[PDB]
Amino acid sequence: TKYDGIDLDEILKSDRLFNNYFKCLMDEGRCTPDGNELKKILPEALQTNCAKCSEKQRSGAIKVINYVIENRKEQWDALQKKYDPENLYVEKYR
Ligand SMILES: [Cl-]
């Protein structure tokens, strides 16, 4: 899985890279092309387990979501209140 030419594990493990995508998702900074695509699918990923997504979109989104839930907890809270206010992902799929 890659976003904008970069391995996604690599983005997730780097504060600098991840903070760029986090800001994109939080409407606080400009999105890269794949960051904007992640933004489009993130509420579906959280609220329906990416029911209508392609497997590729879904695999990347679930990787991001589970990493952030476990390793970037404050950022997870921000993303969850914005994209999954009913907390459906943690309650109903994970
Ligand atoms: Cl690209």
Ligand SMILES: [Cl-]
């Ligand atoms: Cl890419």
Ligand SMILES: [Cl-]
């Ligand atoms: Cl850290």
